[PDB]
Structures are given as structure tokens and as C-alpha cells.
């Protein structure tokens, strides 16, 4: 089954998006939203809740779905540490390159589903040995649901922020 | 495999989904939903069939979706009969709440698969050595068809009768 | 995984499909569409080409998921080969009909992905020694797609021609 941090993140993420169906979106923003003026700088969650928060049913399934599968099989392979490692560093850069570009009205798991893809693939390719491979199959899918980010089917800097994240981790972690 | 009746009752919302798209969505509901006049009241068919319309690629598909996989491990771990119960009390009495809220213009599986939500997470809880359980991840994804259908992503009170149904019944069973 | 030509045609699909999100949709079906001018006519790619291209991320996900998973199977049980020439017949003539109804304005595997949920089907049930059939829970998702196909959720003709291909090649098969 789902690992303690693949699980947690879920599990935040409905709360969060139920929380955003009662509320409204903009009610939860206000809390959860990269910093959108001077006063709120200090509250350090700011930079990471932004990607708890999903607009719409399929961008909370699309995403849950991906994070599920390769979240679930980084944290069973590599343990839980490299999972939260992988989600803090993806979310705060690309969070920080989304903002840059769009401003701070933002949301969502996708930098870090698009870390976790350009890591397990990266990972599966140049070091075999670890268990940890996306395979063809999966490939063709995966570069849909970045194609669906790329061409606004996000800052596709953001894009780029979430998945280069993903491939240097790889790529140190091949060494 | 599916079991005859999870395979059945796929098969007739196909069928009735079908005869939706050649007659119209209206002239089937004339035939098939709760009864809508006194007249009617004694066709006992209508206080089922309800559940057999979909009004939606995406509707038919969910619903059957969830039944497949709810459905088809309740009949092949509990058997046939017991999938039976679990449908017909559900629909009736989801069927009963929604139209008492909104009128007889209704249909779908959805009260069924939410019953089936209900019953196969309470069961595992409650009597693991059943063999019967909802995944962790699958918690996440049935909540998500869940939550779609309480903020109208069907009247809330049928949802509730629904899930009630399932954990009632599956309350019951691990006495 | 999934063999070379599973997988060169979803390699083939993307592409294209990214080059349709950045060059726009008719600029790319200048030059892969079927021949819409005499001038054209020699151009044998455009006969078959037409089938690699796809107008939304829905169309391209469920044809390639369908060609996944029945492609990949064929391939797997029965040689390249055969998925070769299921493939090149029924995107001609599924191709052909679309274009006698509808003209040459039309792309997409979906005529192939007919084929093959035909071909998959009748062998399953004509030849079951062969070790290919269609799940009967598949079997009613593949009336789904079919649906959604007959009912413009194509020409139907064309739909058809697709199928029959996939019939016609499994009845001979089985033989
Ligand atoms: P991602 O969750 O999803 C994109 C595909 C739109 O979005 C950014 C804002 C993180
Ligand atoms: P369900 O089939 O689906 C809801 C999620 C809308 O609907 C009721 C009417 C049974
Ligand atoms: P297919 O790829 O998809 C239909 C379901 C619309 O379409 C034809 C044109 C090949």
C-alpha cells in the first residue's frame, strides 16, 4: 500500500480542495497562497501550501493519480525521506517561478508530479540497478499530462522549474 | 472475472444507455424513471430503473467504473446475493430521498457505487478477516467521486442514503 | 512492456501532437491529412497518416490507452506483424469511408483502435487457444468508446469500416 508521506499528501489535498467547495476558492487562497503581499512574507507555509490546493475535479485527479503512482513508488523504493525531499524543493521552485511570471494566484500538485516524472524517468534510465524505472508505456502519458501543462490545455518556467528539479536530483542520485 | 451480476447490470446501462442516445434522453425516462404520475405508481420496475440512465459519457463511465471494481469484489468475495441486497436497498432509498428533494427526473448507479463505497471501507475497518477492504489510495479517488457529488461537481440527503446504506449494512456484517 | 510498434505509434502520436499545439492544428493537416487536392494524390503517406493526429488531450489519451492496451496485447501474442497490417488496413479504409461521408478535414487512431477491439474481441470467443480475448469488463468499455464514437459524444460508415476490418481479419484468423 500507499507509504505514510505518498498517503499524507493525498489526504491533505482532498481536505484542502473540500475545504476550497464550502469556503469558496478564494477564501482558501487567501490562507494557502504563495505570499501576495509584504505582511504575509514570514508565514513560511505560504511556500509550500500553494500545491495543496486544486481548482477543478480532474486537476486533483490527474494529479493525485500521478503523484499516487510515482510518489508511492519512490517513497517504497527510496524511502520517505527522498519523497519529502523531492516535494519541498519542486514545490518551492516551482512555486517561486509560477509566481514570477503569473503573480501568486496559484495551485497545485503538478510541479511536483512533473519533478517526481522527470526523476523516475531519468532514474530508470541511467541507473537500472535501483529498482526504479517509468516505463514506455507510462512515458507516453506522462508527456501528456506535461504537454497538457506546456500548452495550457501553468508558466511553462514553472514547468521547466518542476521537471529540471526532478532530473538534477536524478541525475546526483545516478552518481 | 465479473460475476454474473456485476456483469448484467453493466451490460442493461449500456443497453439503456444506448436506447438513450437513438430515443432521447426523455422519451427513456418516460419508460424507465420514478414514477412521475399516480398512474404510474404500481409499475414497480420504476422505483429501480432509475438507476439504469446515464445522462453522460462521463457519468455512465464513473459509475460503471466503481461498480466494476466494488461490485465485481463484493460478488466474488461475498457472492452474487449479497451484491443483489446491497443494490436494490440502495437504489430504492437513495432513489426515494432524491426524489422526495428534487423530483422523479433523475437517474444514474451512482447511489449504488456510494452504497458499495460505504460498505467495502466499513467492512475492512471493521472485519478485516472478510478478505474485504478499500485501498488507501482508492479511499482518496472514491472520495473524490464523492465529494462530485455533493457539490454538484444529485441531492445531498440521496447521497447520504446511499453511503448510509452501504455502512449500515456493512456495520451489520462484521457482527 | 510494450513491443517496438505499440510503442513507435504513440511515440509517433505525440510528436505530432505536440507539433500541432505549437504550429496549429490545419497547418499540420496540410501535410498529413488524407489527399485534398489532386495535386496531393501521389503523396501515399496521406492515406495513413491521418491517423496519427489528434484535436484534444481526451481524443489522444483514451485512443492511446485503448492502443496500449490492445496493440500491446496483439503485439505481445502475436507478432508485429500482425498488429502491422490490422493497423495499415483499417486506417485505409476507415480512413476512406470518413473521407467519402465527410471529407478530408478528419485525423485520429480511433478507426485502428475499432479494429482492434473487433479483432480482439471475436478471436477471444472463435479461437480462445490463441490466448487473446477482451475482458468482459473491458468489453463493456470498449462499447463506450464505440458509443461515444456512433453517437458524435466520426462517420458512423466509417466507424464501421473499422470494425468490420477488425471482424473480417479475426474471423479469417481463427480459421
Ligand atoms: P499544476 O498543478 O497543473 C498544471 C497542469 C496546470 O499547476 C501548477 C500551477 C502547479
Ligand atoms: P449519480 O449516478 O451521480 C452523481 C455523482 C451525480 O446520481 C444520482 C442521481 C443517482
Ligand atoms: P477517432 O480517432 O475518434 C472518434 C471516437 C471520434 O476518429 C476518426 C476520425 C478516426
Known sequence: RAGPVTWVMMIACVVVFIAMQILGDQEVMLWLAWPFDPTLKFEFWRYFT???????????????????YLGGAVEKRLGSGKLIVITLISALLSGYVQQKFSGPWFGGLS??????????????????????YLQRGLIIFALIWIV????????????????????????????
Request: proline share 1%; glycine share 12%; aromatic share 16%.
Open 50 to 68: 500553494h500545491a495543496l490546493m486544486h481548482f477543478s475535479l480532474m486537476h486533483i485527479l490527474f494529479n493525485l493519480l500521478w503523484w499516487w
Open 148 to 175: 497538457a501543462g506546456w500548452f495550457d490545455l501553468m508558466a511553462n518556467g514553472a514547468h521547466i522549474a518542476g521537471l529540471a528539479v526532478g532530473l538534477a536530483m536524478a541525475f546526483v542520485d545516478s552518481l
Open 111 to 132: 510541479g511536483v508530479v512533473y519533478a517526481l516524472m522527470g526523476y523516475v524517468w531519468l532514474r530508470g534510465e541511467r541507473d537500472p540497478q535501483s529498482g526504479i
